[PDB]
Design an enzyme around this catalytic site. Structure first.
Site, PDB file in Angstrom:
ATOM      1  N   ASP A 107       0.809  -1.207   0.000  1.00 28.63           N
ATOM      2  CA  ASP A 107       0.000   0.000   0.000  1.00 28.63           C
ATOM      3  C   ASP A 107       0.855   1.276   0.000  1.00 28.63           C
ATOM      4  O   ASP A 107       1.266   1.762   1.040  1.00 28.63           O
ATOM      5  CB  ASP A 107      -0.997  -0.029   1.167  1.00 28.63           C
ATOM      6  CG  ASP A 107      -1.960   1.133   1.124  1.00 28.63           C
ATOM      7  OD1 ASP A 107      -1.815   1.952   0.202  1.00 28.63           O
ATOM      8  OD2 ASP A 107      -2.852   1.246   1.995  1.00 28.63           O
ATOM      9  N   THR A 108       1.095   1.822  -1.189  1.00 31.19           N
ATOM     10  CA  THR A 108       1.905   3.019  -1.360  1.00 31.19           C
ATOM     11  C   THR A 108       1.213   4.239  -0.760  1.00 31.19           C
ATOM     12  O   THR A 108       1.849   5.267  -0.524  1.00 31.19           O
ATOM     13  CB  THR A 108       2.171   3.308  -2.854  1.00 31.19           C
ATOM     14  OG1 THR A 108       0.941   3.531  -3.558  1.00 31.19           O
ATOM     15  CG2 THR A 108       2.927   2.165  -3.497  1.00 31.19           C
ATOM     16  N   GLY A 109      -0.092   4.123  -0.528  1.00 30.54           N
ATOM     17  CA  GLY A 109      -0.883   5.193   0.063  1.00 30.54           C
ATOM     18  C   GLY A 109      -0.838   5.218   1.581  1.00 30.54           C
ATOM     19  O   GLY A 109      -1.365   6.137   2.194  1.00 30.54           O
TER      20      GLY A 109
END
Ligand SMILES: CC(C)CN(C[C@@H](O)[C@H](Cc1ccccc1)NC(=O)O[C@H]1CCOC1)S(=O)(=O)c1ccc(N)cc1
EC number: 3.4.23.16
Lengths: 99, 99
Positions: A25-27
């Site tokens: 999850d880059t967010g």
């Protein structure tokens, strides 16, 4: 590996004896996992998502294995609907976004 | 581009002649932008994340330019903590994760 985004980027992680599915999850700034009783001290913390904040416990220098890669860092533990591998651990496996 | 994750993967997008900062978020299925006006009919929808569900307005087949790259798809609008580019548009720009 190259991971495509047609489906959720779900992977198997190992922490201690426990294997879980989790989102790359880059967010997410930090890693958050659902209920587990990790060793060591923790600090309480609040983290903000869609819909608002949840309370988590912050555990530092925790070994995690991610797609065969041993890394070590902070794991936040609380009532996330989904196990999340955040940037704090993604950087440690050399993970980039590419297009 | 190749984008590393020591910092938030924030990019400039263009939608409806407007420039905005949005987060490349592989843990988001969908794209959610902050309260703005967009034209055409929209459908009310509810989406969920870390801290519960929010109301959004669903706009379909919306042109967006993410960095250089043109996409046309679904943009949801409501009270998101940050502008989010999810996988529906990440896939349209050929974005992958790589380690
Ligand atoms: C919203 C961003 C800025 C941050 N979130 C990460 C996002 O990837 C988040 C991950 C997630 C997936 C599925 C269920 C619940 C959460 N997806 C998300 O909300 O899916 C929505 C947005 C559009 O389509 C669906 S976070 O979870 O709140 C978060 C915050 C802090 C930390 N340390 C970790 C995670």
């Amino acid at each position: 590996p190259q991971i495509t985004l047609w489906k959720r980027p779900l992977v198997t992680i190992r922490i201690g004896g426990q294997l879980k599915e989790a989102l790359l999850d880059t967010g997410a700034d930090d890693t958050v996992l659902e209920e587990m009783n990790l060793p060591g001290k923790w600090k309480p913390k609040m983290i903000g998502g869609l819909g608002g904040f949840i309370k988590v416990r912050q555990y530092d220098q925790i070994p995690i294995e991610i797609c065969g890669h041993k890394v070590i860092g902070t794991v936040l533990v609380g009532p996330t609907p989904v196990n999340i591998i955040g940037r704090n651990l993604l950087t440690q496996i050399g993970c980039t976004l590419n297009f």
